[PDB]
């Protein structure tokens, strides 16, 4: 008996959603369909730009978190916000969906990241996050207890952006490993894998990460190819799981010389793709932890990822677990 | 030309957002479609027990002012936030949909007003409001000038809960009426008429508004009636122009002895019914400040009420002026 299935560890961020056409990306130089780094100054000024928004709680491994809670899977989450009203909403909506999470914020500044993500026409989200609070997070922030009674602990290529946070999870590696439990990670975004590739590549082959998620443009980065079918070849042999998203093309799962291919589900509309990558990675754990097979563990993640993609917000607003008694797959 | 066609004035509030069982009203005792007004105490009680939640700028002068500028009117809004996150986030979403917003925060505290809405499956919504620093809204905050260049001011009913904001609207209703404009208010809801029937009638009956807001409930209540058909004679009787809606069943635009009956637009399936009212008055307002018949801006105020009710949140997300272009409302 494990208290926890999955604990994630994250960039604690509320975002601030609008819709935009695509001229708004050009003329303000944001890269479409990545995450912009900025500072306070580029986050007041792109604010006062941005058209009305909604407010809502992200942060990809905090969303991954709210997904496994949703599905019924028990999960954990290490985040850090500011004592400020932004921070109250990221802890009263990750702890409602039946999240551990007990991270303390050290004061009212830097106030609560947040993160303005621009959604074109088209679906895709173009985000621009002022990291705020989250570069606290640090080691003094590792609950040992639920790291030591988590199935799998799971993280972001993300936290490689502030200073601290690399020791934190250092220190969930080593003891999840002390444990018998098993490291994830996911590559985040392509640009944040070309800054940390090294280090990234390093962390799986040492063996301290031992289940990874890449979409297609993570994979070409972590390589620098264009060849999809050598980066498949290459995260196979630098990690003992590898799951690979390919947006309407589904996923494909690796295992050494295993390859479960898996469909995208049938799907309405792309109303915003924000939280596709975070929530496929809920579905794929769920079943993981839940002892599924690999496909099953995939066929998850693509239900998951195709439900969050429906809706407006990073955060599936109904019942994943309802929706996976009716696809059949628990 | 006049600087402004509608001002409206009314409590400064960003909504919290979550959607419940029938049973979860029953539990918590929630007026179900109703307005409740809470203390600090009981809105840390509720956030409590709330699910994961969405957050969105409110209020109902703030969405009509909103939907007039969405519309292409010349909108302006007075209401008092406070100097904090949840104040910024209003004070830039009205401003960023091209509403005139100068209301100057007081301080941090009492904090800007929330509301937490709860939505059932029926699509009805049940708010719990906590006003917070809607209670520091008084006569300085009257921008003389701008009540002087406005076509319409319009205001809430809900106005009378705080304690010093009736002074406020006698004094744009002198300022108005001295500048040949015209006065509007909405009766809001109906515990709300509740409390304050005598005020309401007076405001009529002393022509200190011209123009009058009410749906079925809310007209009901003012005559404490049950006879829907006497509600309507009597509210003709009592102000110039009376405009109510019906939900499904439309609206009737009064004018002394003119009746103006409008059908409601069909929907695909209510999702929400927050900003329903709000918007029908901000499509009303915007047809009468063009010059519009009675008629045609009961049409406007339906067209623009439909298209709220079939999102979650209460400022439509879409250009309303496309949709008016489209209706041949134009
Ligand atoms: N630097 C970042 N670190 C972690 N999560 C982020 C970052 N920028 C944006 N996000 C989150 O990514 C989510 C979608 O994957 C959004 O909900 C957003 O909050
Ligand atoms: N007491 C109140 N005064 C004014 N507006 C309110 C009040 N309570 C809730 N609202 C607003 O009513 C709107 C729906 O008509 C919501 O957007 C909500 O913000
Ligand atoms: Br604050
Ligand atoms: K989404
Ligand atoms: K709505």
């Given at each position: 008996?494990?208290?926890?299935?999955?604990?994630?560890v994250?960039?604690?961020?509320?975002?601030?959603?609008?819709?935009?056409?695509?001229?708004?990306?050009?003329?303000?130089?944001?890269?479409?369909?990545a995450?912009?780094?900025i500072?306070?100054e580029?986050?007041?000024?792109?604010?006062?730009?941005?058209?009305?928004?909604?407010?809502?709680?992200?942060?990809?491994?905090?969303?991954?978190?709210?997904?496994?809670?949703?599905?019924?899977?028990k999960?954990?989450?290490?985040?850090?916000?500011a004592?400020?009203q932004?921070?109250?909403?990221?802890?009263?909506?990750?702890?409602?969906?039946?999240?551990?999470?007990?991270?303390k914020?050290?004061?009212?500044?830097?106030?609560?990241?947040?993160?303005?993500?621009?959604?074109?026409?088209?679906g895709?989200?173009?985000?621009?996050?002022?990291?705020?609070?989250?570069?606290?997070?640090?080691?003094?922030?590792?609950?040992?207890?639920?790291?030591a009674?988590?199935?799998?602990?799971?993280?972001?290529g993300?936290?490689?952006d502030?200073?601290?946070?690399?020791?934190?999870?250092?220190?969930?590696?080593?003891?999840?490993?002390?444990?018998?439990?098993?490291?994830?990670m996911?590559?985040?975004?392509?640009?944040?894998?070309?800054?940390?590739?090294?280090?990234?590549?390093?962390?799986?082959?040492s063996?301290?990460?031992?289940?990874?998620?890449?979409?297609?443009?993570?994979?070409?980065?972590?390589?620098?190819?264009?060849?999809?079918?050598?980066?498949?070849?290459?995260?196979?042999?630098?990690?003992?799981?590898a799951?690979?998203?390919?947006?309407?093309?589904?996923?494909?799962?690796?295992?050494?010389?295993?390859?479960?291919?898996?469909?995208?589900?049938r799907?309405?509309?792309?109303?915003?793709?924000?939280?596709?990558?975070?929530?496929?990675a809920?579905?794929?754990?769920?079943?993981?932890?839940?002892?599924?097979?690999?496909?099953?563990?995939?066929?998850?993640?693509?239900?998951?990822?195709?439900?969050?993609?429906?809706?407006?917000?990073?955060?599936?607003?109904?019942?994943?677990?309802?929706?996976?008694k009716?696809?059949?797959?628990?």
């Open positions: 008996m494990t208290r926890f299935d999955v604990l994630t994250g960039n604690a961020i509320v975002d601030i959603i609008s819709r935009c056409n695509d001229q708004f990306l050009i003329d303000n130089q944001i890269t479409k369909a995450m912009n780094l500072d306070a580029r986050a007041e000024l792109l604010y006062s730009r941005m058209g009305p928004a909604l407010e809502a709680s992200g942060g990809s491994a905090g969303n991954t978190a709210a997904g496994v809670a949703n599905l019924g899977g999960a954990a989450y290490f985040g850090n916000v004592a400020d932004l921070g109250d909403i990221f802890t009263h909506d990750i702890r409602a969906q039946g999240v551990h999470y007990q991270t914020p050290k004061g009212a500044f830097p106030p609560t990241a947040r993160s303005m993500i621009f959604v074109t026409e088209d895709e989200r173009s985000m621009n996050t002022y990291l705020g609070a989250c570069v606290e997070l640090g080691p003094e922030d590792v609950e040992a207890d639920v790291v009674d988590a199935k799998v602990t799971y993280f972001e993300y936290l490689w502030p200073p601290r946070a690399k020791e934190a999870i250092l220190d969930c590696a080593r003891i999840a490993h002390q444990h018998g439990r098993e490291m994830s996911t590559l985040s975004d392509s640009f944040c894998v070309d800054r940390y590739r090294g280090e990234f590549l390093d962390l799986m082959r063996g301290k990460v031992d289940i990874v998620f890449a979409n297609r443009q993570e994979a070409l980065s972590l390589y620098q190819t264009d060849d999809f079918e050598e980066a498949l070849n290459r995260i196979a042999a630098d990690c003992k799981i799951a690979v998203t390919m947006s309407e093309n589904g996923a494909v799962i690796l295992k050494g010389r295993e390859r479960y291919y898996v469909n995208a589900i799907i309405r509309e792309v109303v915003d793709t924000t939280g596709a990558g975070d929530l496929f809920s579905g794929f754990l769920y079943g993981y932890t839940q002892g599924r097979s690999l496909e099953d563990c995939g066929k998850l993640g693509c239900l998951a990822a195709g439900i969050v993609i429906q809706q407006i917000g990073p955060r599936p607003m109904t019942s994943l677990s309802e929706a996976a009716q696809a059949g797959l628990i």
